[PDB]
Amino acid sequence: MELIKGQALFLELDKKDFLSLKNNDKNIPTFAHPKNQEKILAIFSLPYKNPPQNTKLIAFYKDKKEEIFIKTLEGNYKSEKLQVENKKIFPPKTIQERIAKELKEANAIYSSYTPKALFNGAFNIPLNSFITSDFGKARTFNEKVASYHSGTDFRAATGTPIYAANSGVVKIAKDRYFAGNSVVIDHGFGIYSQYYALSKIDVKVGQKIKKGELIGLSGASGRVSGPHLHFGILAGGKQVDPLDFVSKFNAIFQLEHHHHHH
Ligand SMILES: [Zn+2]
């Protein structure tokens, strides 16, 4: 199999006598295929940054082992040059404790696995065909610093209402240093959706949220300048192309075949 770096893949395996799916030492959790009761699923994701050239997974069954080979593809990522506030790439030493704190909090959330579906059918995606910066765009900040885009940016006037892409539990709902007013929702199965750069936050941590419920208003408080929604997905432990992820998830989990938007 082949997978573009920075993308997720839904792996389908026989359910009968299955024990474990392992990358190297890492256990990859599995969950029931929602339509085919002879199959189970796992989410496998490749990092955008420094991915392996090839991956070998092993599925352990009671009486056999199966090897799954995945070759990393480079894809067709583009690039942009951006001017940002200097503080966003050179934070003063005195604020780096706050950044380190917010990193530890985020890591605790993403390393906590919810072994049940909190979502409800397909993810909604924004009704918006003006992507100002796609996932994985290579970036040069202020002519000298490099990065890559870890989510997808949609042109939106400040104050555009933002609705949860699916049901789940809110895990983050505050201003964070780099990407501003931020909401993160746990959907179960290690799937998290992210909404950054907001001007207003209308949810609170621990709140159960339904698909299509208002979580805030779009803003211009993010790392990059300009009014936009930053939308992200973390799945399989990695930031992945969120529009691509939603397309693959929805093909499996949608309850109706119609168009999925709020
Ligand atoms: Zn962004």
Residue numbers in the entry: 20 to 281
Task: Provide passages from the article that reported this PDB entry.
This enzyme turns over the cell-wall peptidoglycan by both the d,d-endopeptidase and d,d-carboxypeptidase activities, as documented by mass spectrometric characterization of the requisite reactions with synthetic cell-wall fragments. The Pgp3 monomer is structurally divided into four regions: the N-terminal domain (NTD, residues 21–95), a flexible linker (residues 96–147), the LytM domain (residues 148–259), and the C-terminal helix (residues 260–273).
We decided to mutate His216 and His247 individually to alanine in order to abrogate the binding of tartrate or citrate at the active site and impair catalysis too. In the case of the H216A variant, tartrate was sometimes observed in the closed form crystal structure; hence, only the H247A variant was pursued further. The structures are: (i) tartrate-bound wild type (WT) (open form), (ii) citrate-bound WT (two structures, closed form), (iii) H216A mutant (open form), (iv) H216A mutant with tartrate (closed form), (v) H247A mutant (open form), (vi) H247A mutant with pentapeptide 1, Ac-l-Ala1-γ-d-Glu2-mDAP3-d-Ala4-d-Ala5 (open form), and (vii) H247A mutant with crosslinked muramyl tetra-tri peptide 2, NAM-l-Ala1-γ-d-Glu2-mDAP3-d-Ala4-mDAP3-γ-d-Glu2-Ala1-NAM (open form). Since crystals of Pgp3 contained one or three subunits in the asymmetric unit of WT and variants (H216A and H247A, both discussed later) depending on the space group, we analyzed the oligomeric states of the WT and variant Pgp3 in solution using size-exclusion chromatography with multi-angle light scattering (SEC-MALS) experiments.
